[PDB]
Write a protein that binds this ligand. Structure first.
Ligand SMILES: Nc1ncnc2c1ncn2[C@@H]1O[C@H](COP(=O)(O)O)[C@@H](O)[C@H]1O
Ligand SMILES: [Mg+2]
Lengths: 271, 246
């Protein structure tokens, strides 16, 4: 079956123990660091549910390493494109995470430099969707530049509820070193935030990528055509309406190149 | 044997048929674009050997598809930062379209903002990586605007060492040179009739290891170390459900 198969591949647990999941995830971040010899982590904090959970997990890990006589730090970075409409959720989040360091890097001038040149080199202006993708990738560079100057690993916020729909930018938010949220559905993540004592505004707000100037704060559910509950029921093995299955299974097949390394002639996955 | 395992994983053959290799690799390219429904390819051209080989292969795949009655195009892009060999290679490849996107001002803007936000100047190594990652963005911006796939030049000799920037030049959609050693790439270039100037530890030493030739333990130990250290570059981001990083 396709439902059962996507669950295996995305590493989804139909039932989880929040306390235990948190345990395993922080422990993973710890083991990863110790094996590599890195000095810590860096993550762009947007004020959305995903980076809030992932940031708090990195902070708890870093604190645990030091408690053990270890050396490690966490830099949380606000990556606004000028003024962020939901800037206040970003601050309410910094306040819950309590990162070792809070930096800021405005990506606007880099994105402008790029589009000006684009129009100068080609004669055509970048569509809003393409500039949106230039924004996510610029955030990736910002993150990798810091990690590269300070010796830290870049954290990814990828999880199952977006892994299934391939709802991320290849080499933008999809590019990172390690992923502490892998295999968690959207309703399960909220449940870890609840355990962690997160402020409700942070998990009650609508998920959005906010990469468009033409239509900012546009929710994911507007883009996708399904709601996260339907996606979650499916990831969790619940029997769902044929209309949800057909839909998810097609979007999942057409986004496999985002969950794989560059395609070679020796790879079957694409054949 | 780590040598055999590495060879298996990097898909290297001890001996190749340059003519059959060209056909299989072009066929790979045609078939891939037909499966995805994309309109063609986009490759940043550097004058270097690897982008020259991949470019000619891209051009040949595009023409073949057009001869079968379909539609495809190849955009070769030079990406300077603010060229005689890039131009010589452009005459050998003969792409449909030759573009150019100077990365200088984007890299500069990022640099000044960085210094401005952090108080630090980006060191040489880190700024070189910003240049590789910015080239990636330019190629995907063109491909996304034109509905074209980004070709990468990663080959076996570049993969054992992990000598490339993760998401920089490593960021591509497909890789036509996979499994080829540097000297095998050279053979292909001569076969295609490329000018000597383009395909002309020890790089020939890395090839011996990859093609299964008896090498010294010195070369052997260095490479196997390098390879296990660069695994993160040939893998999708890590999670607790993976173990290659352990
Ligand atoms: N405005 C932003 N400021 C800081 N980080 C961000 C911002 N927008 C996107 N990111 C990063 O990209 C990820 C994607 O968020 P989302 O697109 O809502 O999944 C976040 O979890 C952040 O790590
Ligand atoms: Mg968001």
């Amino acid at each position: 079956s396709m439902q059962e198969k996507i669950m295996r591949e995305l590493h989804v647990k139909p039932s989880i123990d929040p306390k235990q999941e948190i345990e395993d995830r922080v422990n993973f971040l710890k083991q990863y660091v110790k094996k590599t010899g890195a000095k810590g982590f860096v993550l762009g904090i947007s004020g959305g549910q995903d980076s809030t959970l992932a940031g708090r997990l990195a902070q708890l890990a870093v604190e645990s390493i030091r408690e053990e006589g270890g050396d490690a730090q966490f830099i949380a970075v606000r990556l606004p494109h000028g003024t962020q409409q939901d800037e206040d959720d970003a601050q309410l989040a910094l306040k819950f995470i309590k990162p070792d360091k809070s930096w800021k890097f405005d990506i606007k001038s880099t994105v402008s430099a790029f589009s000006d040149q684009y129009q100068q080199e080609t004669g055509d202006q970048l569509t809003d969707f393409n500039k949106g993708n230039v924004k996510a990738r610029t955030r990736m560079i910002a993150q990798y530049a810091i990690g590269g100057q300070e010796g830290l690993l870049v954290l990814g916020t990828d999880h199952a509820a977006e892994a299934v729909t391939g709802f991320f930018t290849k080499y933008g938010d999809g590019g990172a070193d390690l992923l502490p949220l892998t295999g968690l559905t959207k309703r399960q993540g909220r449940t870890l935030l609840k355990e962690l004592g997160a402020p409700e505004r942070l998990y009650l707000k609508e998920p959005t990528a906010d990469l468009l100037d033409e239509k900012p704060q546009q929710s994911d559910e507007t883009e996708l055509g399904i709601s996260y509950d339907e996606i979650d029921d499916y990831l969790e093995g619940k029997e769902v309406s044929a209309k949800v299955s057909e839909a998810l299974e097609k979007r999942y097949s057409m986004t496999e190149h985002k969950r794989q390394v560059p395609a070679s002639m020796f790879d079957d996955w694409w054949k």
